[PDB]
Symmetry: C2
Subunit: 281 residues, 2 copies
């Protein structure tokens, strides 16, 4: 185990918020307060969306304590289209904490580095896991570059057999190809055009991914130590001791409890979240 | 319209779903639902909702033919997730009052019958509930060869689906839902490969015959079913007990249906756990 969750309000409502708590029950920012490494050569990944889900959940980069909230497009909650034949998110999508794609130094998502866990277990939202990195894919998302790290849950029974991109090409054939297809097309059902890829849409190996993750971690270091412009990101955190933005545990308590309490009945998700979507090809 | 009486805990070994008509009297989904819902619209009993993994189906040999979970080798059986699909990529079910009479072969295949009602794949957007009764417009048929038997897979669409009007034959599917039929053929070809049995091949070279051919097959199976439910052909255990068919020897009064249902563990409030192995993929 390691971490726990504090949900606030009903899932899929506008005030639904997922906050992360350490072992001691103290609130923490998933974007700042979770050490990038779980053990040597194992990264923490905060899981934003479970595999085969449709809600677009993500770490609120600009809200205090960086809770996981549901993306909003024009006052209406965002869901991801079911791209035929896939059901929504075909991996556990999430972010590696303590990493920042600096929009300066576009070439910048200004979000944590986005991660695709490809193991068999479908993880829960807000669940913190360890992953061994396996590769990276360089997507250009509407004029900004958002890196997609390919990794696997270190506790998956076969995590030993996977150690670089070719093991994915080998033991789960077509997984990378469908990854590329999904990232290329996920914005087309809104009319908006396809997405491009650097390196001619090929997957770069593990060491290249780790170099990029280290780069984003240095960007994050500079960010959370006041050394580079905070550029709109809420940096409030409860653990970083060498940071100006550290705050007392009860500051986090007050920021959470000032929100609607956790709910019991679950909202009914619209029936359009079940429509397919095809392409002619 | 119709209602459901789920009995025992969902996904346990003794879980059974019975169907009730407008008045709460129980009926068999295999005998008592008219094949036609309206003119040229077929009733479909939904056995498994889209993107589910349990293999549920009408118990052809239990009394009143409830929907129960297939059991293969002492363990309740679920369907493996064929990459890139999540389980059933369509509302899978059966057309009632139809029987794939075994021993009787095919002018268009050679082999004999599923010994089930004719199997149906509904392709609308709405993901239907288990035991829910729907109306469908038939649109085509596929002929799978399963172990020396012909397994007919009818392709249809919910007649109440928001765009059900635009669909009237197989080419409308080829046009408005591209890649859907190809993935259908692939899916039926590859399941149970994660359980070792090899792939399945198809008559007509894995092609879909259009609607008139499908309706020929469906009317054929309905005639076989008539023969079954009027004792004209021996069922070999297929339960013909029913509460409405007036031309039937095996019809039984509503308190018989009451007694056969109430003789089961009552409805549940907790839920059994579906394994995380139901979430494992399977590739290539």
């Amino acid at each position: 185990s390691g971490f726990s969750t504090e949900e606030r309000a009903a899932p899929f409502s506008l005030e639904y918020r997922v906050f992360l708590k350490n072992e001691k029950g103290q609130y923490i920012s998933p974007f700042h307060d979770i050490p990038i490494y779980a053990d040597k050569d194992v990264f923490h990944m905060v899981v934003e969306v479970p595999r085969w889900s449709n809600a677009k959940m993500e770490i609120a980069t600009k809200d205090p304590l960086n809770p996981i909230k549901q993306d909003v497009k024009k006052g209406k909650l965002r869901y991801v289209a079911n791209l035929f034949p896939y059901k929504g998110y075909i991996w556990n999508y999430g972010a590696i904490p303590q990493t920042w794609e600096d929009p300066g130094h576009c070439c910048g998502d200004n979000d944590p580095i986005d991660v695709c866990e490809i193991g068999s277990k479908v993880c829960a939202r807000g669940e913190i896991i360890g992953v061994k990195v396996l590769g990276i894919l360089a997507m250009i998302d509407e004029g900004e570059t958002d890196w997609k790290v390919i990794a696997i849950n270190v506790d998956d029974p076969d995590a030993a057999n996977y150690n670089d991109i070719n093991d994915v090409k080998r033991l789960k054939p077509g997984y990378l190809e469908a990854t590329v297809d999904w990232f290329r097309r996920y914005k087309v059902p809104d009319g908006k055009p396809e997405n491009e890829f650097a390196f001619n849409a090929e997957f770069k190996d593990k060491d290249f991914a780790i170099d990029i993750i280290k780069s984003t971690h240095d960007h994050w270091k500079a960010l959370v130590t006041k050394k580079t412009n905070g550029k709109g990101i809420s940096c409030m955190n409860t653990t970083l001791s060498e940071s100006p933005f550290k705050c007392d545990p009860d500051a986090a308590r007050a920021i959470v409890d000032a929100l609607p309490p956790p709910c019991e009945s679950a909202c009914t998700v619209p029936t359009d979240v079940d429509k397919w979507f095809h392409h002619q090809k």
